[PDB]
């Protein structure tokens, strides 16, 4: 089921992002009952730069994913705590991604907190180990210095590169922000694997 896969792979996502957990991994039954009762499950992780990443796993039928008022209240209360808050990851069912009320709430909360990154993702983005999918080539983020020297050698601007959405599943698991560069090792049936660099653009939704 979506909840079980989410529970088993969200910590794989957190560890793949090179983050350490701040709480104890509760049992699956406790996680699902907390989602049903509270309406969401919160996971807090610490990045290598001591930033805080909050992963909110919203239940399908919860009150936070169909009424914009509760979503606004939750986001405001969670963004007012004394934490560094490098990024907020909100995980919802795919239909919630089309709700203009919740999307507008996310937009205004992002505008009100420009420093903080807030992203809303569907369930399927964390229901599998995305980097281990066979069809997905190995994505990797390159530093701005390596990208700058690549662009200088190629006489290119970042806007001349092929683009990749920040909401791309491999980019999400990488953690790439818009304006960054991601190097991709794609298999080639002409040259037996090739390397490409894509510019990360604004995330869809």
């Amino acid at each position: 089921m979506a909840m079980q896969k989410l529970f088993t792979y969200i910590y794989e996502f957190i560890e793949y992002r090179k983050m350490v957990l701040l709480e104890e991994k509760v049992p699956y039954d406790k996680f699902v009952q907390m989602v049903l009762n509270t309406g969401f499950f919160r996971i807090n992780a610490e990045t290598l730069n001591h930033g805080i990443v909050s992963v909110f796993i919203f239940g399908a039928n919860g009150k936070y994913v169909h009424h914009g008022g509760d979503m606004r209240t939750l986001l405001t209360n969670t963004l007012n705590e004394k934490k560094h808050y490098e990024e907020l990851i909100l995980i919802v069912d795919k239909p919630v991604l089309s709700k203009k009320n919740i999307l507008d709430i996310i937009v205004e909360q992002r505008a009100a907190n420009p420093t903080i990154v807030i992203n809303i993702y569907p369930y399927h983005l964390f229901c599998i180990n995305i980097p281990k999918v066979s069809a997905i080539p190995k994505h990797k983020l390159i530093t701005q210095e390596e990208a700058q020297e690549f662009l200088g050698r190629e006489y290119l601007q970042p806007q001349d590169l092929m683009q990749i959405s920040a909401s791309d599943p491999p980019v999400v698991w990488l953690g790439g922000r818009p304006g960054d560069f991601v190097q991709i090792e794609r298999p080639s049936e002409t040259a037996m694997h090739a390397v490409v660099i894509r510019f990360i653009t604004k995330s869809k939704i």
């Binding site: 089921m1 979506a2 896969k5 369930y123 399927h124 229901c127 599998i128 180990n129 995305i130 281990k132 999918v133 066979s134 069809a135 997905i136 080539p137 994505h139 092929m162 683009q163 990749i164 959405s165 791309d168 599943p169 491999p170 980019v171 991709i184 794609r186 298999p187 080639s188 049936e189 002409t190 894509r198 653009t201």
Partner: protein
């Protein structure tokens, strides 16, 4: 032994615990793009075009050209008008040459579009000749050589 289904539900198959979720192959490019990304979608485009091509198909680099053209923006664009609008919004002359010249011209006029002259259709529609092929590199005269040799 594997299972070949009718209909694509990649997410549903990943949720299922009786099939390998890391080797799910779906014939649909939209599901692959939504579930896996633009690189997997480009590989899916290559595979689907190759399947359509048949036994006597073209070289693989032409399928690569198709798939890289359609996925260059990070989203799967088409070979229709909408794909040209997404990939070359400012190429008013090429989009006019494709189809609907009056509508493209009207939108260009109200949009104050600036059309750099590149490619094939844009230089051709202005009576010029594309800067490709024998005219990609421009020739300059060797002044030193002519001065020291062609007295």
């Amino acid at each position: 032994y594997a299972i070949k289904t009718n209909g694509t539900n990649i997410f549903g198959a990943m949720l299922d615990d009786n099939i390998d979720p890391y080797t799910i192959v779906s014939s649909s490019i939209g599901d692959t793009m939504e579930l896996y990304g633009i690189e997997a979608a480009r590989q899916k485009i290559i595979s689907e075009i190759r399947t359509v091509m048949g036994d006597k198909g073209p070289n693989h680099r032409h399928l690569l050209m198709y798939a890289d053209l359609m996925t260059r923006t990070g989203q799967v664009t088409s070979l229709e008008k909408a794909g040209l609008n997404a990939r070359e919004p400012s190429n008013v002359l090429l989009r006019m040459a494709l189809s609907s010249p009056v509508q493209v011209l009207t939108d260009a006029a109200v949009d104050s579009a600036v059309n750099p002259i590149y490619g094939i259709a844009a230089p051709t529609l202005m009576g010029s000749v594309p800067r490709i092929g024998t005219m990609y590199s421009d020739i300059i005269m060797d002044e030193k050589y002519i001065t020291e040799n062609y007295k």
